[PDB]
mmCIF file of C-alpha atoms in Angstrom:
data_model
loop_
_atom_site.group_PDB
_atom_site.id
_atom_site.type_symbol
_atom_site.label_atom_id
_atom_site.label_comp_id
_atom_site.label_asym_id
_atom_site.label_seq_id
_atom_site.Cartn_x
_atom_site.Cartn_y
_atom_site.Cartn_z
ATOM 1 C CA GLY A 1 -23.752 11.985 10.078
ATOM 2 C CA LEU A 2 -21.564 9.267 8.937
ATOM 3 C CA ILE A 3 -18.554 11.589 9.687
ATOM 4 C CA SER A 4 -18.559 13.593 12.749
ATOM 5 C CA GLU A 5 -17.928 17.415 12.703
ATOM 6 C CA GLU A 6 -14.645 17.123 14.284
ATOM 7 C CA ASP A 7 -13.427 14.724 11.669
ATOM 8 C CA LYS A 8 -14.642 16.854 8.933
ATOM 9 C CA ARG A 9 -12.653 19.749 10.297
ATOM 10 C CA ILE A 10 -9.483 17.445 10.428
ATOM 11 C CA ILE A 11 -10.094 15.997 6.941
ATOM 12 C CA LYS A 12 -10.349 19.489 5.554
ATOM 13 C CA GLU A 13 -7.127 20.928 7.212
ATOM 14 C CA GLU A 14 -5.135 17.609 7.050
ATOM 15 C CA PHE A 15 -5.999 16.473 3.654
ATOM 16 C CA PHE A 16 -8.281 18.525 1.333
ATOM 17 C CA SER A 17 -6.344 21.761 2.007
ATOM 18 C CA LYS A 18 -3.513 20.392 -0.062
ATOM 19 C CA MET A 19 -5.681 19.668 -3.083
ATOM 20 C CA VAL A 20 -4.808 21.376 -6.321
ATOM 21 C CA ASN A 21 -6.752 20.156 -9.226
ATOM 22 C CA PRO A 22 -10.430 19.218 -8.700
ATOM 23 C CA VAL A 23 -11.302 15.634 -8.015
ATOM 24 C CA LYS A 24 -14.371 13.709 -8.971
ATOM 25 C CA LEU A 25 -15.379 10.462 -7.376
ATOM 26 C CA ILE A 26 -17.270 8.343 -9.969
ATOM 27 C CA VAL A 27 -19.190 5.652 -8.008
ATOM 28 C CA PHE A 28 -20.670 2.776 -9.892
ATOM 29 C CA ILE A 29 -23.561 1.095 -8.214
ATOM 30 C CA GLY A 30 -25.683 -1.973 -9.099
ATOM 31 C CA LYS A 31 -28.205 -4.268 -7.398
ATOM 32 C CA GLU A 32 -25.421 -6.880 -6.594
ATOM 33 C CA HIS A 33 -22.844 -7.051 -3.855
ATOM 34 C CA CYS A 34 -23.911 -3.700 -2.249
ATOM 35 C CA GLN A 35 -25.079 -4.327 1.256
ATOM 36 C CA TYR A 36 -23.137 -1.147 2.211
ATOM 37 C CA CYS A 37 -24.256 0.945 -0.757
ATOM 38 C CA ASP A 38 -26.066 3.468 1.208
ATOM 39 C CA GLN A 39 -23.043 4.040 3.443
ATOM 40 C CA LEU A 40 -20.749 4.396 0.211
ATOM 41 C CA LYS A 41 -23.046 6.912 -1.297
ATOM 42 C CA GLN A 42 -23.520 8.896 1.855
ATOM 43 C CA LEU A 43 -19.647 8.802 2.250
ATOM 44 C CA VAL A 44 -18.692 10.344 -1.221
ATOM 45 C CA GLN A 45 -21.386 12.824 -0.432
ATOM 46 C CA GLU A 46 -20.165 13.847 2.784
ATOM 47 C CA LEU A 47 -16.526 14.235 1.626
ATOM 48 C CA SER A 48 -17.597 16.057 -1.484
ATOM 49 C CA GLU A 49 -19.352 18.789 0.617
ATOM 50 C CA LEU A 50 -16.055 19.566 2.457
ATOM 51 C CA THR A 51 -14.350 21.283 -0.603
ATOM 52 C CA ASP A 52 -15.292 22.831 -3.946
ATOM 53 C CA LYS A 53 -12.420 20.839 -5.346
ATOM 54 C CA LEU A 54 -14.265 17.521 -4.765
ATOM 55 C CA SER A 55 -17.379 16.281 -6.337
ATOM 56 C CA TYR A 56 -19.021 12.913 -7.015
ATOM 57 C CA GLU A 57 -21.536 11.333 -9.358
ATOM 58 C CA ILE A 58 -23.438 8.218 -8.651
ATOM 59 C CA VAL A 59 -23.682 6.006 -11.706
ATOM 60 C CA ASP A 60 -26.263 3.266 -12.270
ATOM 61 C CA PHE A 61 -24.219 0.350 -13.444
ATOM 62 C CA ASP A 62 -27.287 -1.655 -14.295
ATOM 63 C CA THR A 63 -28.286 0.509 -17.220
ATOM 64 C CA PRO A 64 -26.866 0.768 -20.665
ATOM 65 C CA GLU A 65 -25.370 4.313 -20.222
ATOM 66 C CA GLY A 66 -24.017 3.113 -16.925
ATOM 67 C CA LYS A 67 -22.323 0.098 -18.482
ATOM 68 C CA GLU A 68 -20.877 2.351 -21.254
ATOM 69 C CA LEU A 69 -19.350 4.759 -18.669
ATOM 70 C CA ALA A 70 -18.061 1.619 -16.764
ATOM 71 C CA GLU A 71 -16.289 0.402 -19.895
ATOM 72 C CA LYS A 72 -14.593 3.919 -20.560
ATOM 73 C CA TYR A 73 -13.277 3.837 -16.818
ATOM 74 C CA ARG A 74 -12.301 0.113 -17.200
ATOM 75 C CA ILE A 75 -14.644 -0.986 -14.338
ATOM 76 C CA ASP A 76 -16.064 -4.445 -14.662
ATOM 77 C CA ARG A 77 -18.402 -4.839 -11.599
ATOM 78 C CA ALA A 78 -19.979 -2.674 -8.790
ATOM 79 C CA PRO A 79 -19.782 -1.321 -6.360
ATOM 80 C CA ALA A 80 -16.632 0.475 -7.408
ATOM 81 C CA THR A 81 -15.227 3.879 -7.049
ATOM 82 C CA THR A 82 -12.630 5.437 -9.488
ATOM 83 C CA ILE A 83 -10.936 8.697 -8.152
ATOM 84 C CA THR A 84 -10.439 10.887 -11.071
ATOM 85 C CA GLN A 85 -8.801 14.077 -11.786
ATOM 86 C CA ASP A 86 -11.626 16.250 -13.119
ATOM 87 C CA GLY A 87 -12.867 13.127 -14.982
ATOM 88 C CA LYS A 88 -9.350 11.971 -16.015
ATOM 89 C CA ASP A 89 -8.693 8.415 -15.262
ATOM 90 C CA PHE A 90 -5.577 7.739 -13.135
ATOM 91 C CA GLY A 91 -6.425 3.988 -12.557
ATOM 92 C CA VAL A 92 -7.037 4.507 -8.888
ATOM 93 C CA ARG A 93 -10.018 2.345 -7.875
ATOM 94 C CA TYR A 94 -11.755 1.037 -4.786
ATOM 95 C CA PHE A 95 -14.132 -2.050 -5.038
ATOM 96 C CA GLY A 96 -16.413 -1.711 -1.942
ATOM 97 C CA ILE A 97 -16.521 0.692 0.959
ATOM 98 C CA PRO A 98 -13.331 2.211 2.005
ATOM 99 C CA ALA A 99 -13.982 1.587 5.740
ATOM 100 C CA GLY A 100 -11.654 1.029 8.850
ATOM 101 C CA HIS A 101 -8.051 1.425 7.932
ATOM 102 C CA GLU A 102 -8.850 2.020 4.240
ATOM 103 C CA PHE A 103 -10.547 5.346 4.996
ATOM 104 C CA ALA A 104 -7.298 7.318 5.514
ATOM 105 C CA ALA A 105 -5.827 5.584 2.373
ATOM 106 C CA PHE A 106 -8.852 6.694 0.465
ATOM 107 C CA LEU A 107 -8.410 10.449 1.601
ATOM 108 C CA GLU A 108 -4.802 10.346 0.558
ATOM 109 C CA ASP A 109 -5.561 8.995 -2.889
ATOM 110 C CA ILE A 110 -7.966 11.787 -3.381
ATOM 111 C CA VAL A 111 -5.096 14.321 -2.598
ATOM 112 C CA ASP A 112 -2.547 12.470 -4.646
ATOM 113 C CA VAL A 113 -4.899 12.215 -7.793
ATOM 114 C CA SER A 114 -5.710 16.056 -7.073
ATOM 115 C CA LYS A 115 -1.898 16.841 -7.153
ATOM 116 C CA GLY A 116 -1.321 14.194 -9.880
ATOM 117 C CA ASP A 117 1.828 13.255 -8.011
ATOM 118 C CA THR A 118 3.235 10.821 -5.586
ATOM 119 C CA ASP A 119 6.136 10.233 -3.267
ATOM 120 C CA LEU A 120 7.665 7.297 -4.951
ATOM 121 C CA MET A 121 11.423 7.203 -5.378
ATOM 122 C CA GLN A 122 12.766 8.509 -8.642
ATOM 123 C CA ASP A 123 14.092 5.139 -9.650
ATOM 124 C CA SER A 124 10.470 3.727 -9.152
ATOM 125 C CA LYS A 125 8.937 6.380 -11.231
ATOM 126 C CA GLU A 126 11.383 5.920 -14.145
ATOM 127 C CA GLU A 127 10.607 2.206 -14.240
ATOM 128 C CA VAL A 128 6.868 2.588 -13.908
ATOM 129 C CA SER A 129 7.023 5.123 -16.791
ATOM 130 C CA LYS A 130 8.238 2.543 -18.971
ATOM 131 C CA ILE A 131 5.378 0.023 -18.448
ATOM 132 C CA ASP A 132 3.271 -0.153 -21.583
ATOM 133 C CA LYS A 133 1.139 -3.170 -21.165
ATOM 134 C CA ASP A 134 -2.360 -3.412 -19.480
ATOM 135 C CA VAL A 135 -1.733 -3.944 -15.982
ATOM 136 C CA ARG A 136 -4.378 -4.721 -13.301
ATOM 137 C CA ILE A 137 -3.320 -5.008 -9.595
ATOM 138 C CA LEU A 138 -5.837 -6.322 -7.198
ATOM 139 C CA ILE A 139 -5.353 -5.864 -3.454
ATOM 140 C CA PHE A 140 -7.618 -7.932 -1.309
ATOM 141 C CA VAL A 141 -8.201 -6.346 2.196
ATOM 142 C CA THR A 142 -10.495 -6.102 5.193
ATOM 143 C CA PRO A 143 -11.354 -2.723 7.144
ATOM 144 C CA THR A 144 -9.556 -4.235 10.188
ATOM 145 C CA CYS A 145 -6.208 -4.912 8.498
ATOM 146 C CA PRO A 146 -3.682 -2.054 9.386
ATOM 147 C CA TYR A 147 -1.153 -3.131 6.753
ATOM 148 C CA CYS A 148 -3.637 -3.440 3.922
ATOM 149 C CA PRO A 149 -3.615 0.348 3.272
ATOM 150 C CA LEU A 150 0.018 0.285 2.648
ATOM 151 C CA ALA A 151 -0.452 -2.281 -0.364
ATOM 152 C CA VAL A 152 -3.466 -0.386 -1.640
ATOM 153 C CA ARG A 153 -1.591 2.861 -1.685
ATOM 154 C CA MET A 154 1.547 1.405 -3.358
ATOM 155 C CA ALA A 155 -0.478 0.060 -6.246
ATOM 156 C CA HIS A 156 -2.206 3.285 -6.536
ATOM 157 C CA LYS A 157 1.022 5.363 -6.795
ATOM 158 C CA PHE A 158 2.048 3.030 -9.513
ATOM 159 C CA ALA A 159 -1.080 3.704 -11.350
ATOM 160 C CA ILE A 160 -0.760 7.441 -10.822
ATOM 161 C CA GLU A 161 2.786 7.568 -12.131
ATOM 162 C CA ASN A 162 1.994 5.472 -15.064
ATOM 163 C CA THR A 163 -0.856 8.000 -15.825
ATOM 164 C CA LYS A 164 1.592 10.877 -15.446
ATOM 165 C CA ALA A 165 3.937 9.207 -17.909
ATOM 166 C CA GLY A 166 1.320 9.127 -20.562
ATOM 167 C CA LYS A 167 0.610 5.499 -20.528
ATOM 168 C CA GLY A 168 -2.384 5.100 -18.175
ATOM 169 C CA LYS A 169 -2.232 1.282 -18.374
ATOM 170 C CA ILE A 170 -1.923 0.299 -14.695
ATOM 171 C CA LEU A 171 -5.115 -0.127 -12.718
ATOM 172 C CA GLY A 172 -4.763 -0.406 -8.897
ATOM 173 C CA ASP A 173 -7.819 -2.029 -7.502
ATOM 174 C CA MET A 174 -8.359 -2.197 -3.721
ATOM 175 C CA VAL A 175 -10.888 -5.062 -3.145
ATOM 176 C CA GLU A 176 -12.833 -5.054 0.151
ATOM 177 C CA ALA A 177 -13.062 -8.826 0.753
ATOM 178 C CA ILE A 178 -16.112 -8.753 2.842
ATOM 179 C CA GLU A 179 -18.200 -7.397 0.156
ATOM 180 C CA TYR A 180 -16.603 -9.494 -2.676
ATOM 181 C CA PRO A 181 -16.292 -12.913 -0.899
ATOM 182 C CA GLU A 182 -16.717 -14.885 -4.233
ATOM 183 C CA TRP A 183 -13.896 -12.813 -5.893
ATOM 184 C CA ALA A 184 -11.661 -13.258 -2.750
ATOM 185 C CA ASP A 185 -12.471 -17.073 -2.658
ATOM 186 C CA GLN A 186 -11.255 -17.134 -6.333
ATOM 187 C CA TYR A 187 -7.670 -16.278 -5.096
ATOM 188 C CA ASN A 188 -7.855 -18.315 -1.915
ATOM 189 C CA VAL A 189 -7.619 -15.121 0.062
ATOM 190 C CA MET A 190 -6.761 -15.939 3.692
ATOM 191 C CA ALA A 191 -4.276 -13.605 5.106
ATOM 192 C CA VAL A 192 -4.493 -10.007 3.982
ATOM 193 C CA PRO A 193 -3.378 -8.105 2.062
ATOM 194 C CA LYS A 194 -3.357 -10.401 -0.960
ATOM 195 C CA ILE A 195 -1.884 -8.973 -4.170
ATOM 196 C CA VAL A 196 -2.649 -10.333 -7.613
ATOM 197 C CA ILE A 197 -0.816 -8.810 -10.467
ATOM 198 C CA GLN A 198 -2.291 -9.507 -13.927
ATOM 199 C CA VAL A 199 -0.941 -8.581 -17.252
ATOM 200 C CA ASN A 200 -3.213 -8.274 -20.273
ATOM 201 C CA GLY A 201 -5.921 -10.038 -18.354
ATOM 202 C CA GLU A 202 -4.050 -13.005 -17.133
ATOM 203 C CA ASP A 203 -2.748 -13.498 -13.586
ATOM 204 C CA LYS A 204 1.069 -13.575 -13.453
ATOM 205 C CA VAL A 205 2.059 -12.801 -9.859
ATOM 206 C CA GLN A 206 0.566 -13.403 -6.417
ATOM 207 C CA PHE A 207 1.803 -12.656 -2.936
ATOM 208 C CA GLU A 208 0.785 -11.727 0.582
ATOM 209 C CA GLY A 209 1.747 -8.758 2.793
ATOM 210 C CA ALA A 210 2.461 -5.075 2.244
ATOM 211 C CA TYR A 211 5.701 -5.366 0.259
ATOM 212 C CA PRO A 212 7.866 -2.336 0.491
ATOM 213 C CA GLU A 213 8.300 0.042 -2.434
ATOM 214 C CA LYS A 214 11.344 -1.599 -4.065
ATOM 215 C CA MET A 215 10.033 -5.188 -3.661
ATOM 216 C CA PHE A 216 6.505 -4.628 -4.795
ATOM 217 C CA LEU A 217 7.926 -3.018 -7.844
ATOM 218 C CA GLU A 218 10.326 -5.916 -8.337
ATOM 219 C CA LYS A 219 7.215 -8.136 -8.149
ATOM 220 C CA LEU A 220 5.487 -6.059 -10.744
ATOM 221 C CA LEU A 221 8.428 -5.989 -13.154
ATOM 222 C CA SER A 222 8.828 -9.686 -13.014
ATOM 223 C CA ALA A 223 5.109 -10.012 -13.852
ATOM 224 C CA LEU A 224 5.845 -8.180 -17.101
ATOM 225 C CA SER A 225 8.073 -10.867 -18.461
#
């Protein structure tokens, strides 16, 4: 009972009732960094039981088949969850448990991936549609940070539109800092959210705070230079 019966009802009528295409949550789990693996596994299961348009699959990252699946979905470590549209990679990932304020953002991502659509401004979709370089966006957060979801959701919408444009080169990765301290220490994460925009594997831009759509995009674009 990780999710109460009342919440299940609310999740179904407020979120999953808007789903269109089936969504599959592919969760990679290994023997490292997963103090909250049981909750993560129980979580994706409880959500999947809410609708026939949502399913999950727990993948063992510590095995050769698991590693290969990880490569196909561009996942380099576990725990990690990629929200796919019936297996199709949209670059919407969560590294760690989506607890606290990140829970609602997780639910919305499922819907947006189901619909394969976002509410970004037209100007922003047109720009994001032109991006043709491997872009990885890290969003360091904590379950307690109320603004963090905004940054996670913004990067994810960028990933979705870039997938819709037929590029599929933008990866939006929410990183739960409490579970990935070493990774967070790597970018001197203090205040959250902390955004790191990488192009072709190398860091190019870094900032703190949930930047509005136009400014977040401005930072993404400058990173591509």
